[PDB]
A paper describes a structure:
The yeast diadenosine and diphosphoinositol polyphosphate phosphohydrolase DDP1 is a Nudix enzyme with pyrophosphatase activity on diphosphoinositides, dinucleotides, and polyphosphates. ScDDP1, like its human orthologs, adopts the canonical Nudix fold showing two β sheets flanked by helices. The active site lies in the crevice situated between both β sheets. The longest helix (α-1) contains the Nudix box (GX5EX7REUXEEXGU), which displays a β-loop-helix-loop structure that binds the Mg2+ ions involved in diphosphate moiety orientation and catalysis.
We have performed site-directed mutagenesis on Glu80, Glu83, and Arg32. Both mutants on acidic residues produce inactive forms of the enzyme or those with very low activity. While Glu80 binds Mg3 (its equivalent in HsDIPP1 also binds Mg2), Glu83 forms a triad structure with Arg79 and Glu80, fixing a perfect orientation of these residues. We crystallized inactive DDP1-E80Q in complex with 1-InsP7, showing also bm2 mode for the inositide; however, there is no Mg3 in the active site as expected, and, in consequence, the diphosphate moiety only fits in a nonproductive conformation. The DDP1-E80Q mutant precludes Mg3 binding, and, in consequence, it selects only the conformation of 1-InsP7 with its diphosphate bound solely to Mg1 (bottom). Mg3 is only present in wt-ScDDP1. E80Q and E83A impede the metal coordination and, in consequence the catalysis, but they have no effect in substrate binding as seen in this section.
Residue numbers in the entry: 20 to 103, 113 to 186
Write the structure that this text describes.
């Protein structure tokens, strides 16, 4: 729908999501992408014009995409999808300047329940991963900005 909300500055699509952690904080909940069937990501989605805050969007998408209920325990701030040839400064190399694709507002959630039936339960897989596994999945998914969000969480990395 054209019910989506965009940054008035950069025109980046405004998305909220959840780093959903087990109470012991040893594992994060990950879902498969709908387009890229084999790629493991975290629950997230576009803010809608009616929604009063990012927490609403985040908890709605965590239910819809992952059948996961929990309490938001931290605001993990923002990360950007910086995807659209190169510009070399002679001490480093960078991609040619462009506006961000997406601006993500992430929250840490403590999982309280996982339900077997949820809206996207037939079009996605869903599973708990240790930090090391989760980190490798996000690299495999080519989503370093989601890994940045994961890294700000209280997930045990040792
Ligand atoms: O192509 P990507 O990787 O940039 O991401 C995809 C993202 O998929 P992802 O790869 O993040 O898993 C899709 O979401 P999905 O995972 O639910 O299929 C999402 O579709 P959407 O309109 O439902 O938007 P959300 O991703 O719930 O905010 C967007 O897809 P669309 O091309 O079908 O409209 C998004 O695309 P962008 O506009 O580029 O952000
Ligand atoms: Mg999504």
């Amino acid at each position: 729908r054209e019910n989506q909300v965009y940054s008035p500055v950069t025109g980046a699509r405004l998305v909220a999501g959840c780093i959903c952690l087990t109470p012991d904080k040893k594992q994060v909940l990950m879902i498969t992408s709908s387009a890229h069937k084999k790629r493991w990501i975290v629950p997230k989605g576009g803010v809608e014009k009616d929604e009063p805050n990012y927490e609403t969007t985040a908890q709605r998408q965590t239910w819809e995409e992952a059948g996961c209920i929990g309490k938001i325990v931290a605001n993990l701030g923002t990360v950007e999808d910086m995807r659209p040839q190169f510009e070399n400064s002679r001490k480093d190399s960078e991609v040619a300047k462009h506006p961000p694709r997406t601006e993500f507002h992430f929250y840490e959630l403590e999982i309280e329940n996982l339900l077997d039936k949820f809206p996207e339960c037939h079009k996605r897989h869903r599973k708990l991963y240790s930090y090391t596994e989760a980190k490798q999945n996000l690299i495999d998914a080519k989503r370093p900005e989601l890994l940045e969000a994961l890294n700000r969480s209280a997930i045990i990395k040792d």
